[PDB]
Design a binder for this molecule. Structure first.
Ligand SMILES: O=c1ccn([C@@H]2O[C@H](COP(=O)(O)OP(=O)(O)O)[C@@H](O)[C@H]2O)c(=O)[nH]1
Ligand SMILES: O=c1ccn([C@@H]2O[C@H](COP(=O)(O)OP(=O)(O)O)[C@@H](O)[C@H]2O)c(=O)[nH]1
Ligand SMILES: Nc1ccn([C@H]2C[C@H](O)[C@@H](CO)O2)c(=O)n1
Ligand SMILES: Nc1ccn([C@H]2C[C@H](O)[C@@H](CO)O2)c(=O)n1
Ligand SMILES: [Ca+2]
Ligand SMILES: [Mg+2]
Ligand SMILES: [Mg+2]
Lengths: 222, 221
């Protein structure tokens, strides 16, 4: 009954910044941010920092946790909200086919880890995930260079060392999935999901009238 | 509606051997073996072998996988007269015996151990309330015995297991199933009947007594 929209985008693209501008843009819009605050405080340890420090060792662990939390956080919000619209920061899909995938392709996860990961991911969704099916997706598109700026801009520490190559790898992944719609999944229905693509290479912190304009148009057809 | 019994015991104690002697003693008794096969075959790689080879690196991974599978396997057999279902080990022995000991042994750090438990709690809380045990059968054997039967079985990944390891596991079993002093987050547990059987002696062909006590146990459930 509640429309479910997923906001996707490369690291530091503008998801959070954008997602906020919407939180208030209308009382009938709730947001489900990425539970990052929860991955950076696991028993006074930063697991995001641990992956970025030794990916060959922590990727699997980290990726697995990230996804688990993401689900719980989203399953969560689905209780506590006329024209209901729920906005997710990233989604289980981008978790597996963008980050997890890329980590494997980059040898940061071996056959065993990657195999387990997917089986687990499939099980999870098949289980506590049916009700998390998206009705739409908003691709906040930005070049690898721009996102790199915003990471440096945001100032989060674990990310300050991220190489443009990483950015690049994930930018292509994003594109193939959201823009071109070439990358396939195990979730058949994503093949019929609307995908609004917004170019946010330019600052929109105070120039989003257009963006928010297109968002409404998008949602009306849902 | 289906009675759920869990067979617990140290490595190579006799769980499988015992659990079989039962599946064929009443078309009303089904068994849910420990998916130890599915572990040894993950994309042509043995994850059990990977943990025993470098625990500091694979324990968490392995432990996590093991429990996931165990649950799926049990949830499965759950669906499909005086129905009794026998589980080889249980999510409880997974966490408070093996996972726990791996942490206590520095094979899992604070981060891994923390994540493990939170996940474990979430899992059970979720797709688990239907896996609650009605009873437990503790197949008790000294680590000495378990160590010999590890040779007799011949599984490779285990041939290098040290007695002290076998010992540490034994005490975790003793604490939770005999002296009942090890507490969990599942309050119901310490309120579940616990039949303890001494299997230090070979029962492959002398189980009349064992199976006798099993029936007595189940009648009071
Ligand atoms: O139009 C914009 C979009 C982003 N940012 C900066 O980029 C950083 C990361 O943006 P965000 O928090 O949205 O990251 P994301 O949620 O996309 O990972 C923040 O410090 C923002 O101030 C900015 O200055 N202008
Ligand atoms: O009464 C018995 C119980 C066990 N075993 C041997 O102990 C090993 C381990 O048995 P099992 O596979 O049941 O171990 P578990 O699955 O309980 O760890 C095998 O070689 C069994 O044949 C035996 O010789 N006699
Ligand atoms: N499955 C995911 C999801 C997010 N992140 C990262 C990207 C950022 O560095 C941080 C915040 O999104 O987490 C990741 O590596 N893997
Ligand atoms: N949580 C568990 C469960 C089982 N095993 C191991 C012990 C034996 O080597 C094999 C069969 O029980 O699996 C383990 O290390 N950790
Ligand atoms: Ca902290
Ligand atoms: Mg963010
Ligand atoms: Mg066995």
């Amino acid at each position: 009954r509640i429309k479910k929209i997923s906001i996707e985008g490369n690291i530091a693209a503008g998801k959070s910044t954008f997602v906020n501008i919407l939180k208030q843009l209308c009382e009938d819009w709730e947001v489900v941010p990425e539970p990052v605050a929860r991955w950076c405080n696991v028993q006074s340890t930063n697991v995001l920092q641990m992956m970025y420090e030794k990916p060959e060792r922590w990727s699997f662990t980290f990726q697995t946790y990230a996804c688990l939390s993401r689900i719980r956080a989203q399953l969560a919000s689905l209780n506590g909200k006329e024209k209901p619209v729920l906005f997710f920061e990233r989604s289980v899909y981008s978790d597996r086919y963008i980050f997890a995938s890329n980590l494997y392709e980059s040898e940061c996860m071996n056959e065993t880890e990657w195999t387990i990961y997917q089986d687990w991911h499939d099980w999870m969704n098949n289980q506590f995930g049916q009700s998390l099916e998206l009705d739409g997706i908003i691709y906040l598109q930005a070049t690898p260079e721009t996102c790199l700026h915003r990471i440096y801009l945001r100032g989060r520490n674990e990310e300050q060392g991220i190489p443009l190559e990483y950015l690049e790898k994930l930018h292509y992944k994003h594109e193939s999935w959201l823009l071109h719609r070439t990358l396939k999944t195990n979730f058949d229905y994503l093949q019929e999901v609307p995908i609004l693509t917004l170019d946010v290479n330019e600052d929109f912190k105070d120039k989003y009238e257009s963006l928010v304009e297109k968002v409404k148009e998008f949602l009306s057809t849902l």
